[PDB]
Each structure stands twice: as structure tokens, then as C-alpha cells.
Amino acid sequence: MDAIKKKMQMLKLDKENALDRAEQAEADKKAAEDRSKRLEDELVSLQKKLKATEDEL
Amino acid sequence: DKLKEAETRAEFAERSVTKLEKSIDDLEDELYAQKLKYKAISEELDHALNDMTSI
């Protein structure tokens, strides 16, 4: 019929919206986790430099 | 006379023919309209399925 087609269109539009939001959230999560692991490496490096300075002291 | 007993029938079949012709003309026209509507509905269903054809 006709209204069934409208329902089919609507039931896919929200699917597209959800997929777009999912992609955005995935990108943001990956970027944040990469920054966090980089800061972990930074903290390890800072600990090593503190240890070396304590050795010189 | 013997004329009238048949002429009565002669005129009688005139209205018979008129009713039959107008009725059959209406019948064929409405039948064709119904067939066109059914064809439209069937095509609507099939082509609505095929316009979908997954998205």
C-alpha cells in the first residue's frame, strides 16, 4: 500500500541515526583511550626520570 | 388484427434491447475499472517490495 511504505521509511531513518551516533561514539571512545594510554606511558617515563634524578642525588 | 399481437412484441423487444445494451455497457466498464484497480494494487505490492529490496 502507501502508509506501509511510510512506516518502512521511518523504521530505517532512525536506524541510520543510530548508526551515525554509534560511529561517532566509537571514534570518540577510541581517541580518548589512545590519549589515556599515551598519558600512561608519560607517567611511566616521568617515574623513570624521577628514579634517575634520585640516583644522581 | 394479427398485426398488433406481434407488433406488441416488436416494440416490446426494443426496450429489452435498450436495457440489455446499457446494462452490459455499464457492466464491462465497471469490470474494466475493477480489473485496473486490482492490477494497480498488485503492482503496488510487488513494486513496493522491490523498491524496498533491502536498504
Structural domain boundaries in chain B: 1-55
CA distance A42 to A49: 10
Q: Among B46, B43, B23, B47, which residue's Cα sits nearest to residue B35?
A: B43
Which cell numbers in the block locate residue A23? 560511529
Report how far residue A12's alpha carbon sits from residue A18's, in angstroms, rounded to the nearest whole number: 10
**What is the chain A residue with the closest CA to B44?**
A1
**Would you call A12 and B55 a contact, using CB atoms and an 8 Å cutoff?**
yes
Q: Is A5 on the interface with B (CB under 8 A)?
A: yes
Q: Contact A12/B44, CB-based, under 8 Å?
A: no
Q: Could you give the CA distance from residue B36 to residue A5 in angstroms, rounded to a whole number?
A: 21
Non-local (6+) Cβ contacts of B48 within 8 A are: A1, A4, A5
CA B18 from chain centre, in angstroms, equals: 15
Residue range of the domain that includes A17? 1-57
CA A6 to chain centre: 35
Q: How close is the nearest chain A Cα to the Cα of B44, in Å?
A: 6
* Mutation site for B-interface testing, chosen from A7, A8, A10, A19 by largest number of B Cβ within 10 Å: A8
- B2 half-sphere exposure, CB direction, 13 A CA radius: 0
Backbone angles phi, psi at B13, to 5 degrees: -70, -15
Concatenated DSSP letters of B3-52: THHHHHHHHHHHHHHHHHHHHHHHHHHHHHHHHHHHHHHHHHHHHHHHHH
Q: Label residues A43-52 b or e (16+ Cβ within 10 Å = b).
A: eeeeeeeeee
A4 vs B55: CB contact, 8 Å cut-off?
Answer: no
Total domains in chain A come to: 1
Q: CA–CA separation, B29 vs B42, rounded Å?
A: 20
Resolution for this experimental structure (Å): 3.5
Question: Rounded to whole angstroms, how far apart are CA atoms B34 and B27?
Answer: 10
A49 CB-near residues (< 8 Å, 6+ apart): none
The x, y and z cell numbers of residue A37, run together, are 594510554
